Write an enzyme that holds these catalytic residues in place. Sequence first.
Site, PDB file in Angstrom:
ATOM      1  N   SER A 244       0.795  -1.222   0.000  1.00  0.00           N
ATOM      2  CA  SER A 244       0.000   0.000   0.000  1.00  0.00           C
ATOM      3  C   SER A 244       0.834   1.283   0.000  1.00  0.00           C
ATOM      4  O   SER A 244       0.299   2.369  -0.175  1.00  0.00           O
ATOM      5  CB  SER A 244      -1.050  -0.001   1.113  1.00  0.00           C
TER       6      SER A 244
HETATM    7  C1  VPP Z   1      -1.805 -10.176  -4.725  1.00  0.00           C
HETATM    8  C2  VPP Z   1      -2.377 -11.006  -3.599  1.00  0.00           C
HETATM    9  N1  VPP Z   1      -2.101 -10.321  -2.330  1.00  0.00           N
HETATM   10  C3  VPP Z   1      -0.756 -10.480  -1.736  1.00  0.00           C
HETATM   11  C4  VPP Z   1      -0.777 -10.383  -0.171  1.00  0.00           C
HETATM   12  N2  VPP Z   1      -1.628  -9.263   0.303  1.00  0.00           N
HETATM   13  C5  VPP Z   1      -1.281  -8.605   1.544  1.00  0.00           C
HETATM   14  O1  VPP Z   1      -0.302  -8.948   2.187  1.00  0.00           O
HETATM   15  N3  VPP Z   1      -2.111  -7.534   2.023  1.00  0.00           N
HETATM   16  C6  VPP Z   1      -1.774  -6.855   3.253  1.00  0.00           C
HETATM   17  C7  VPP Z   1      -2.551  -5.584   3.358  1.00  0.00           C
HETATM   18  O2  VPP Z   1      -3.575  -5.439   2.708  1.00  0.00           O
HETATM   19  N4  VPP Z   1      -2.032  -4.588   4.269  1.00  0.00           N
HETATM   20  C8  VPP Z   1      -2.722  -3.361   4.460  1.00  0.00           C
HETATM   21  C9  VPP Z   1      -2.083  -2.276   3.649  1.00  0.00           C
HETATM   22  O3  VPP Z   1      -0.815  -2.173   3.539  1.00  0.00           O
HETATM   23  O4  VPP Z   1      -2.843  -1.467   3.058  1.00  0.00           O
HETATM   24  C10 VPP Z   1      -2.745  -3.070   5.944  1.00  0.00           C
HETATM   25  N5  VPP Z   1      -1.539  -2.483   6.468  1.00  0.00           N
HETATM   26  C11 VPP Z   1      -1.851  -1.749   7.721  1.00  0.00           C
HETATM   27  C12 VPP Z   1      -0.706  -0.845   8.098  1.00  0.00           C
HETATM   28  O5  VPP Z   1       0.098  -0.431   7.230  1.00  0.00           O
HETATM   29  O6  VPP Z   1      -0.547  -0.481   9.299  1.00  0.00           O
HETATM   30  C13 VPP Z   1      -3.212  -1.063   7.624  1.00  0.00           C
HETATM   31  C14 VPP Z   1      -3.095   0.378   7.281  1.00  0.00           C
HETATM   32  C15 VPP Z   1      -3.992  -1.254   8.945  1.00  0.00           C
HETATM   33  S1  VPP Z   1      -4.049  -1.923   6.328  1.00  0.00           S
HETATM   34  C16 VPP Z   1      -2.029  -7.664   4.494  1.00  0.00           C
HETATM   35  C17 VPP Z   1      -3.235  -8.355   4.672  1.00  0.00           C
HETATM   36  C18 VPP Z   1      -3.438  -9.105   5.848  1.00  0.00           C
HETATM   37  C19 VPP Z   1      -2.443  -9.150   6.849  1.00  0.00           C
HETATM   38  C20 VPP Z   1      -1.242  -8.450   6.668  1.00  0.00           C
HETATM   39  C21 VPP Z   1      -1.021  -7.709   5.490  1.00  0.00           C
HETATM   40  C22 VPP Z   1      -2.773  -8.846  -0.454  1.00  0.00           C
HETATM   41  O7  VPP Z   1      -3.479  -7.918  -0.066  1.00  0.00           O
HETATM   42  C23 VPP Z   1      -3.094  -9.511  -1.701  1.00  0.00           C
HETATM   43  O8  VPP Z   1      -4.200  -9.354  -2.206  1.00  0.00           O
END
Ligand code: VPP
Length: 520
Positions: A244
């Site tokens: 992100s």
């Molecule tokens: C292409 C397939 N594939 C690959 C893998 N994958 C992810 O590893 N996803 C991340 C994700 O979504 N992280 C978010 C982000 O950075 O936006 C979170 N980070 C936090 C923060 O920075 O504090 C927040 C602001 C509270 S939200 C995830 C999901 C669940 C747990 C940890 C990390 C995907 O999503 C995805 O579809």
Amino acid sequence: RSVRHIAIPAHRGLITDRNGEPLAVSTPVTTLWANPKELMTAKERWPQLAAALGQDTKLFADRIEQNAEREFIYLVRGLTPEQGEGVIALKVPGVYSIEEFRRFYPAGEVVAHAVGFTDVDDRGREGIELAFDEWLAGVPGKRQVLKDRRGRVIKDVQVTKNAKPGKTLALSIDLRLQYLAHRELRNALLENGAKAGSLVIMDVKTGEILAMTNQPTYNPNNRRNLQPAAMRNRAMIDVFEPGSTVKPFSMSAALASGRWKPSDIVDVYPGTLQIGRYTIRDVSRNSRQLDLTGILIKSSNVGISKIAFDIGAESIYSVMQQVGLGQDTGLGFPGERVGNLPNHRKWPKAETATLAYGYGLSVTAIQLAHAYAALANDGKSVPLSMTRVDRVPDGVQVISPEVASTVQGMLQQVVEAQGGVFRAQVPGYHAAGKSGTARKVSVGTKGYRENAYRSLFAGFAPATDPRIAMVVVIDEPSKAGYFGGLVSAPVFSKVMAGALRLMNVPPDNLPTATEQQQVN
Ligand SMILES: CCN1CCN(C(=O)N[C@@H](C(=O)N[C@H](C(=O)O)[C@H]2N[C@@H](C(=O)O)C(C)(C)S2)c2ccccc2)C(=O)C1=O
Ligand SMILES: [Cl-]
């Protein structure tokens, strides 16, 4: 009875930080050698000689006896000038001194990855020592000595070649910022029980890399039990999916498209978007529609995916390439990776969305910091440098001033607004940035790991006139959570605070300022 040509060691070039602090210095040392033929005639001087060399009497004697045939052997290498002259003062027949150089690294492990080291033969093998080996090296001289039948040196006859020293090299790194960054990343690594980490600090106006530190690290002055993994300048040579943290660039593409404006509301309910077999998920599922700023604050994958579908992947690819993601930095640091910005002839929805929220591409910490530098610098990208710059280089306007200004404002909100990344707030300053958390890629298969993460935070400060950009990456935290905004954000907070104070940047947020900042 003949003449030998012996080398005259050349001074290797001084490596300094941006302000002249020594990072690598050739220090004078003394090597003692002996002619056993001569030593065999003064056996009664041995125990005293052995004791002055800290060596066992018998073991010393053994060494000399089994080499009685020879005319040259090393006694001890790399004494201090005083220690060597202490043994020479003994006036033992057959014992000679030769002045050499030892490469010394005053900051040790603090800058080991950037500076690197020379090997036994004085050639650069890692880091800057390898990259600028030609510049740094200099050229040994030759002199002739006359030796008699038994190998006794009787006369220094002539110098046939003068030694020429290598050249000084001023790095862009500010050692003060390096110490701070080093210590705080270490602390973070240890607090979080992380496996590894990187931290980059970049001057956004000049392109100079002010600090670049990684964990694990090592002591280049003592490499006895060095392991390969501790050697890696990960900020430069390791690649990761930025997740992100590329969203402000997807957002810049959206505002550049003429199809979107800050007030536009995207509907993200119910925090998932099924597209064929692939399913996009938000970790925050508390809001059901978000404006453009709220997509960044809530870090909505679904929100940015719907924007991506509208503007198309080529729009997003373009800004990412322009801000240098997946591109050659031109730095020429040995082992440095270019990363990868994928390019399909036809872009399906799946790949269009994942790119937009930072997967399917790979960058280095250096690249990420460089991209935030450009955004911080009002959309003007400036060439990276790891050496000190005299003139501020010409930039390339990669994002328009207005769009960069809008995206700056949004990233300031990501940090300062309610529900935002509050652990990234910098006391006394307005900061801007974006946290990220990426599941690590599976070992031994395709896909993502269930319980291993990479914590990211990228940003810049002061918001009112950005001076420095910074990227914090922490691999596999295991002790106090794993989210970017929980793990990496507080590190950004601390280092940015210290860095800005060190560079005398006047605080732009006095309401939250520190003890002495409120006096000035
Ligand atoms: C292409 C397939 N594939 C690959 C893998 N994958 C992810 O590893 N996803 C991340 C994700 O979504 N992280 C978010 C982000 O950075 O936006 C979170 N980070 C936090 C923060 O920075 O504090 C927040 C602001 C509270 S939200 C995830 C999901 C669940 C747990 C940890 C990390 C995907 O999503 C995805 O579809
Ligand atoms: Cl608007």
